[PDB]
């Protein structure tokens, strides 16, 4: 009927005959196309009859090219005319020949034809400059790319919760991400994933990781792997791999051993080349070799399909001194097309901070740099990247700085880019904003959310009134909640406290305000609601439910008790229901307690107020304050 | 990439993963091998050399290269052997420009052409080769392929999905239309940050599925499905104005012979000057075509003209309009009619097809997921072909309408030529509540009737003198001595906005308002909240004011002097001119109103009086008075 | 050899992933081999083929290489060429072509080679300048007849007044712009790219600031002004920037004095050329009837170093540029043409941009200028003011034609740099800086600019800011005394007006105490203007202390803020009710009075006896008496 000569490439998704007998089609398949290609090859060479034709044939002989069938035709040609053409008049023949295109009499054949040839030759080479000349104004223009030269722009902020120094950052090519790391006190990092334009998203605190200096971050078929140097238990050295998790890891069966036996002998961290395939490290020399060596760190290229499995040190460098240390201290490694490009270092203050490059194979400094900004009109130094566009395969060197003393640290990234490249990473991401881009209200992250404490991004949001009825965090109980709300949520501090405020949506009610702090790492830390008493004239009513006044425990926040309904309340002065109005104060006290105030609502008559304190200090008497009216 | 040599000794997820993964790169490399063989048997040049080929005859084995070498130069001998004593000026011209001497004249003449040729040949190849690297980089434009980048999202004060949107070449400003209740569609036109501008309802338009937008020597014309009275179908034309619309003397007919025999509408090229229209098959005729959609292409200019010619048609396969891929948009570029389908929920995705509009044939279905960090599911709709005015650089325009059902968020994402995206982008910044330098932004009236007048969001100042004509100001124009900043937050997605007023008083306390105004009709604003903030300052009551009942705004307190109590014709009578006194308002129900006075009494008893007064009546003032003590 | 395995396992075994892995390997390693073997047979292998499978085919003849050479070979051979004169042969053999074509004559055959050649050769030089021109196009265009202006960036100064000039600075980034005040002054703000507010200048006596012309000299920035003396008479010179104020005299030098002293003389800078561009008066007397006002001198930057007077090319600016309805707002000049921007804001007639070539005299364009559009909301028709300057890329050399512009009316009087770039710098411009934001680019807190300030009132840039608890101790503006500072605290800096009062808003960092809240205006030019601490009164339930430090009540004067006060600390205060104390707990309440005076409330916190309540006056008009209150216990 007919037989397709094409693979399984989904596959039954459990072990069965069918399983088998899918991989064994595909096996037999792959078999007969191998065996094919194998006779297809034999064939060609021995038996395919017009395996090419001839002008698919170079003729190459005393620097002239042809192709075997145009000079089978030509000699051909030259044979046909030696037969067929007419014999002339020698000398009149080769007189008219003297003559060029443009009807000028040269004196010779000689002249005529080297006239000829040296004018088209004139003009072809003035043709070729202006393509090589114009290719190279081209290629200058898209392509220039010169670390010791070009000044760096600013690209974005990077926004941790973390107050601490940038070890290192890395941009992901394909989602974007930023992945960057922040040594902690207790000899663990932190590993920060944020946003194109810096702003947080999860973090992983790699436990005994150490200083966390740098990362090496490889795609392997669609699957993101992260190479760190981390310490056991014992606090020796580990040379390790993983894939990025939210929350926590330790040097364990969570995270992969990569050669164990070569790596663990000293400090081993890396960083990974997409464009070469190639895994750079940068391994401590055991403290006896400083004293010898006089250089602290060195550098070994190796392959990392290598890597995946065999021993081989491409090119090692000594990194010499002063690059490591005292007042220029390693901040910052990347490479690039055989360049190894070190940032240095503490500053603060004084000194400058130093960018070099260095010639991996020759060992040779191939520049010495002074980096320098001043935009926010000292700075410190903060790593390196060498970012790799996916869509144009345009590069940039990526320059991390942590700027500010110790409370005030904020940290950017800086770039030397291949034309368009900082322009496209300026604005991957907009800079985070209240809104949406149009000015209106952002969207909720959740529908009817449990908490509000969710809502973890800065901004402006709304909440509609079934959209409140879930909450486990409201600062009203269930029973007012008959309501849309504003909720604002604005930056706190570094660590990871925002602000909320909720603005209840009222024109002809008071429009009720409350504001709290929130620990977006931990929601028992999250502080109670404050209640900001604003007023338009308007009353608030107790719903029907309440039969006590000792529910309502807001302070500022009052209510209005009409003479019917100051019947219903069990714990209203016993001699003074249904009789008058009265507004209900609700006033500060201690933990555990409340202060009311029932203000009575009289016009002819006196005015009385009745003022109770209650709760773990017990329920307290009302005590009766009564005025004389006056004219 | 490389196959997977170590496997799963475990037959899990990962085991089956990438046992398909090895089989997908098999195919991948067999078909390239097959390729290069086939490139290499019919069209490589230069496949081989001439001394790589076998050339036998007489049990005497030579190559190709020298034996051609061998018959030329028999040749020339040959030739030099039939050539008498020669022509010395012949001979002369043997020796080419280098200096070499040739054997013949047909040698030298051979050798010189072959060398330019060759030459030329290779600049030649060299200037196509710059020139193709050239436009791929600067002109790419591959909608199979490439990923849609944001640009921007789109605010109107409409809570429903969007059908379509137009970017506007010469004014920026997007037009995007969203169906109503009633058979209505709104046309919004948007800023190109999405700030909302003003609006147009297209009464009995329908669904506003989608509009062709073409100016016509600098006018705008937007030509549109409509229903007439009857709710028959209309081919209209109709400038842009706010408000209301509807079928009448106020459009114009387009063609109405021709196109009113089924439902309609258009979307128009501006670079091969066509109208594209996709019209709907009645429902006797779906079955028969297996189709509810064809589409014809014609010129703008016929159209103009009254003449009717379709120049190219295609019927839409049912699988593209169905109701797992309903259609969510269509454009047109470059011979290519662009479908984009999809289904609000169920986990089917969207796609985005191109079809060639003369051969009917399906070039490319995708998936279009926004799985992004300007996203971090997604509901399709519309799509527009931007044309650059400047450049005549293009980008195909996807719209989204994202969120879990309700309230809906709109962007535009797209895949465009070099540097289309980043011009989009930043054609207007996105929304602030400063200026670019962080300074208060204007204000849109000078001395405004009502400051509900001012409906975009951000932080403004008004001056003494600009508060003077407000209408709808907390306080009244006694009370209006002071400059004040003004702030207007977001509120909701309908239209709600809230504005706060701060006054700038640096030696009197910042009196603080908050309200939340309807900006499409302020009959629905609400009170002013006053919000009290003290910095130990008093406050004064206008001399203009000789009655406390005046003073209604809760928790705004004054101060009243031993002189100034005197002035208050409602002031406890035997209280008057003796000492200074705080007013405290307090909370009542709606048309009363509590006050306190409380007296600045120092040495001697402290007093306080109470009154509640309004609609209840004007209640009576109550003494409270205090024992002095240690 | 090695073959695939094509008869696996029937159970999920190690023998099954083996073969598996067997296979796989087995298909990269021939797949690797049949590459190899391939580009060896293209490349290297001797005897890849026999010339009997490659075809030759031509016309008539259809063969193989093989047979066709044998047979070229025989026709060598069989050939009977006659001895047929003096180079006849030769001649009649030159007479073929490389394709194998027998032309009539050498002539013809040297003709039909040379033809092809030259019509080859040309067609390849059409597309090489075609190529070329489309490129230059496409990235150096620069067209300001027809190019529309694309929207840069706002300037936010702290000056209620319409801008006179603005020059970008190609190093630095930093834009300045004049305003002329009243009393003949100009303020001279430096500005970031994005608009934002640094520092500025008052140049007293400096005249109108229409423009001045700004030059690096060996990294040093230096401003030729035009300015007056005490005498009010016209002075062009030179200074180097500074904050604050500078007059005619010894902080300004004389730029060749006795050359353009003569009249109102002021300038620009061109550093391509390295010209100084003079705009300069006509004076009364050497005017007649409706002859121009202003004329133009093109001068050479080392001339001017070396005080060398030498016009290189001078133009009138005829009156029809300088006049009621079109008077003078803009100034440039790039690669031999003098830009001209006129307009009259309250006419209503157009803003005009003029070319003019320099050296002939000749208006190049005059073009309508409205830039109302999507970014002023669409204010065209309130043009206010407008400036030009011309951007020179010091990375790139591209440049941008920059057009300023102000639109009003009075008090809602915003400033403008509109652009006509070449390719990329209104991209590169427009993005420098990005616009100000209230976080950092992630939405986390800005950075403070000092650490433990002396004054909160030096935070003069708006932003959402934090400040720990050890920032707080040193403030001398701080809203609580430092006995309360035991907590970190949000603050708020927002905009306030358009001449420099901005509003701070504090907020205590307080899970399980009450946040509190303070806001004031203060004054960025003059502290000594701020205002006082607004308390805004806030509550989450929670009792406040008093500071055991603290032993006056009369010390707690913030209206709002209660404390509670126990029966152990009632003891403590000098001032408490002396036959009070000891007795119970009590909230403190501090209220509303005059300035210089407070009122407060000690209210008790008793449970089953009657409630007690004791209000005071004091300050300024004394140290008032406590006056008890006393209530009546009921059911
Ligand atoms: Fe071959």
């Known amino acids: 009927g007919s037989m397709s000569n094409k693979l399984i490439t989904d596959l039954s998704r459990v072990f069965d005959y069918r399983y088998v007998d899918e991989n064994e089609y595909n096996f037999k398949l792959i078999s007969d196309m191998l065996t094919d290609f194998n006779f297809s090859l034999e064939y060609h060479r021995n038996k395919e009859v017009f395996a090419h034709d001839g002008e698919q044939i170079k003729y190459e002989h005393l620097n002239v090219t042809s192709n075997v ?62 393509v ?50 922040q040594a902690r006190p207790g000899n663990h990092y932190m590993l920060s994933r944020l946003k194109p334009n810096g702003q947080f998203i999860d973090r992983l605190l790699v436990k005994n990781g150490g200083h966390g200096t ?93 890597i995946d499995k065999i021993d081989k040190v491409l090119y090692q460098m000594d990194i010499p001194m002063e690059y490591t240390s005292d007042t220029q201290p390693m901040q910052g490694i990347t490479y690039d097309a055989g360049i190894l490009y070190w940032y240095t270092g503490d500053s603060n203050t004084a000194n400058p901070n130093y960018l070099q490059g260095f010639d991996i194979k020759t060992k040779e400094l191939l520049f010495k740099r002074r980096i320098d900004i001043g935009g926010v009109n000292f700075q410190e130094a903060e790593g390196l990247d060498m970012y790799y566009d996916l869509e144009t395969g345009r590069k940039a060197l990526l320059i ?122 931990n929601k028992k830390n999250n502080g109670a609601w404050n209640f900001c008493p604003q007023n338009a004239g308007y009353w608030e009513h107790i719903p029907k439910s309440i039969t006590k006044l000792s529910d309502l425990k807001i302070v500022g926040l009052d209510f209005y008790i009409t003479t019917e309904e100051s019947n219903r309340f069990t714990d209203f002065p016993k001699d003074f229901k249904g009789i008058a109005g009265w507004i209900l104060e609700v006033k500060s006290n201690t933990p555990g307690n409340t202060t009311q105030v029932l203000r009575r609502n009289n016009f002819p008559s006196a005015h009385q107020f009745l003022v109770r304190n209650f709760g773990t200090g017990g329920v307290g008497k009302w005590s009766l304050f009564e005025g004389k009216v006056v004219e």
């Open 69 to 130: 069938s145009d000079f089978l035709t030509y000699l051909n040609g030259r044979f046909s005319n030696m037969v067929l053409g007419h014999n002339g008049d020698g000398i009149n023949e080769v007189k008219d020949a003297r003559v060029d295109n443009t009807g000028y009499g040269h004196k010779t054949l000689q002249d005529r034809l080297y006239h000829d040839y040296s004018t088209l030759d004139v003009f072809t080479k003035k043709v070729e400059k202006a």
């Open 132 to 181: 090589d000349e114009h290719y190279k104004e081209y290629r200058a223009t898209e392509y220039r790319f010169e670390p010791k030269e070009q000044e760096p722009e600013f690209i974005t902020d990077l926004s941790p919760y973390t107050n601490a120094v940038m070890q290192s950052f890395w941009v992901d090519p394909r989602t974007k991400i930023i992945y960057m790391t």
């Open 214 to 306: 740098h990362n090496a971050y490889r795609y392997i078929d669609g699957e993101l792997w992260i190479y760190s140097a981390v310490l056991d238990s014992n606090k020796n050295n580990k040379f390790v791999r993983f894939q990025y998790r939210t929350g926590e890891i330790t040097y364990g069966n969570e995270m992969q051993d990569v050669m164990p036996n070569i790596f663990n002998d000293r400090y081993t961290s890396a960083i990974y080349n997409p464009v070469e395939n190639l895994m750079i490290f940068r391994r401590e020399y055991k403290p006896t070799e400083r004293q010898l060596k006089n250089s602290l760190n060195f550098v070994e290229v190796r392959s990392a399909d290598d």
């Open 400 to 521: 991390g700085v942590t700027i500010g003393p110790g409370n005030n640290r904020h940290h950017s990234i800086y770039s030397i880019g291949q034309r368009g490249v900082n322009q496209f990473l300026k604005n991957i991401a907009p800079q985070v904003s209240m809104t949406d881009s149009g000015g209106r209200v952002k969207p909720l992250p959740i529908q009817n959310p449990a908490y509000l404490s969710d809502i973890t991004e800065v901004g402006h949001y709304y909440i509609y009134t079934q959209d409140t009825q879930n909450a486990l965090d409201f600062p009203l109980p269930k029973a007012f909640r008959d309501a849309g709300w504003f909720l604002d949520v604005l930056p706190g501090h570094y660590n990871g406290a925002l602000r909320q405020v909720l603005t209840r949506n009222s024109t002809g009610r008071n429009m009720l305000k409350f504001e709290r702090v929130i620990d977006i790492f």
